[PDB]
């Protein structure tokens, strides 16, 4: 299920359960736009920032 | 529904505004002291699907993301404030202005407007008024027994009498200068008023601080180049046709989807 | 259930292509506009092993992967205005947004605000901050960035500022925002500012404005092609629906 | 909105300026201490598709 | 083309760009294995009939 | 479909042809201008049946099946003929009769080459061209000049009040190239050398195949006005024909899709 969702506190999670990566479940900046790479890299861009 | 429809609608509206500006320029080609105006366009926002420069993979970035346009809009219009051609009318109460500056008139409600159309008359009270009744701000008052009126290059107005040989000075026809002439707000009857864009007007005598002189007996003609206008008309007609064809194609594909 | 989604992706791709075509046709008169083309590429292939050469890879739809701007040189239109500037070659004028960041533009159409500075149509000021004085009898911008204003009673014109311009090692990666402005991204290199005519920078023409590089005939042919592709691709949906209905009838 | 149209527009403008200087010279043919004028033209930038 | 995994993938579509280092890449970030490097301040890029 | 992608190339070729025609017609009065003509080229071919393949044990195909792809404008060239001379009665106007280009020092330090001869003198007395650029041999004219004489030799001589013979101020050399058609044509009526163009060869006028210099004349553009009208008729008709081809393909596809 690739329908990834981000919570109010930057917690990446598929329906019901958090997504994990290196270490524990991954957490992103609070409201940054998320881009998913072709190899699994997560780029986060804080809005308004250049 | 379909975004291309709205994009083409914006294009059609932009072409319509361009045609309106061209028609306005052509209409008052014989207006004295008229400045042609050109519209400037720009594009609307862009919808970014993939952020440029984002990590395409490890140690690699996306060379260029996916961004889709939205349309165009006219952003502003600029008047070419250049020197027009002078035409002679042999009338002694018409003055053209060479260089920069504007004559100052007082609108009836009490405000001040700045004009460039020099063709004046004299009211029943003897004052010097513009074609329209607004009196010139320095308040030139011509006496009754007037034979000839001389307005010098430096803006000093004198009138000759019958008895005494020496002409009598009547006033000074000084003129105003702005930081940004293009920023003046334009209203009817060849009048401009100061806005926030144009700096505070500063009055000056003609021929000093970069203010132009006065030529009596001539009127400044509009700086409209009809040869450019006709080619622009051809361009806008063709662009309007192209955008209409785009609208038609979008309608055709939407209809085909509907018939499904 | 099988070809419906593939045909949906095809229709979406044709719709996006039509969108970029319409956007290109819309701003055919915007100064300094650069035409865009979208590029697609097919999606992942599923493979079915043979029992026990193998093969049998069933594909799926197509997706738009990027859109690129053709950063070419446009024709020059004459306005007779003394503040319009056109670029000869490569380079972008540097302008400062009111927020504090910096943007870059190709549209040379400059005016002067009440303070005498040089701004673009919209209020943004050119970053080197050319400060034209009052009583400017005439203003001239030469091949280089030198801006000289002649004053009454002065023999030698007084230089009032220098108009540098910036270049990038990858201008296609510049992010585009409204009103003909670009912001540098990670893909685009760090901006390098230089005087015109040196280190690959262009020259400046006074009184001319750069046009847009849009080819109307190409757009019309692309319009015909995309309309026909969409019309054909609808047939896949129609046939799939009919055969699925025939299947579910029994 | 094609390149040929803009090229022809520039040509028309150049011819108009030439006619303007001709008419100016003819107008003040009887002005003492007057010197004639002649305009000089140059071609604009060239866009290179294939580099020579 | 050099894949992120390190293996080589071979393609037919011709649509290339340059990244922030000037290296020639495809539309998507993948690099062409011969690694043609285009310097900055370049007036024009020519790709001849051969691979030069 | 293929026919659309062929007719599109046809339309683009006609458009480039019209563009070069319009460029030639625009600066018909630009001194020292050389007309430009475009040469096209057909694109690659798709071979379905290879010509010369063995049709049987003995016979072979006379001509296989090949399908064209379109046309591509391969290049454009400039005709370096000799334009007519026009008299201006100006002492500083030079017209070159033959072959060669005046060398000019660009501000950046590089060197350009031009054929339009119409010069002035800056405030320092140096000989410059219209545009501010100076002639490379740096001909300097004193302030006490009465007249400027530029003989067919290329030697610039100037006369002064109360003198018997004029004093030579310099020699106006000119450069010729092995292939002047290969000169990269930058704006402002200037050419710069490239790899295709040979190394410049500087010489005095009238020697080693160089041209001569006439003072008081300007070299007019060698644009044939009569030929442009018929070229325009041909270009317009070809464009209309290709447009009709596109329309036919569109009608064919439209009939096909509603099947």
Curated annotation (Swiss-Prot), chain A:
Source organism: Salmonella typhimurium (strain LT2 / SGSC1412 / ATCC 700720)
The name this protein goes by in its record: Flagellar basal-body rod protein FlgF
Compartments where located: Bacterial flagellum basal body
Family according to the record: Belongs to the flagella basal body rod proteins family.
Lineage, top ranks: Bacteria, Pseudomonadati, Pseudomonadota, Gammaproteobacteria, Enterobacterales
Subunit structure: The basal body constitutes a major portion of the flagellar organelle and consists of five rings (E,L,P,S, and M) mounted on a central rod. The rod consists of about 26 subunits of FlgG in the distal portion, and FlgB, FlgC and FlgF are thought to build up the proximal portion of the rod with about 6 subunits each.
Gene that encodes the chain: flgF
Entry superkingdom: Bacteria
Curated annotation (Swiss-Prot), chain F:
Cell compartment(s), UniProt: Bacterial flagellum basal body
Family: Belongs to the flagella basal body rod proteins family.
One term under GO cellular component: bacterial-type flagellum basal body, distal rod
Subunit structure: The basal body constitutes a major portion of the flagellar organelle and consists of four rings (L,P,S, and M) mounted on a central rod. The rod consists of about 26 subunits of FlgG in the distal portion, and FlgB, FlgC and FlgF are thought to build up the proximal portion of the rod with about 6 subunits each.
Entry keyword set: Bacterial flagellum
Main location, first listed in the record: other
Descriptive protein name: Flagellar basal-body rod protein FlgG
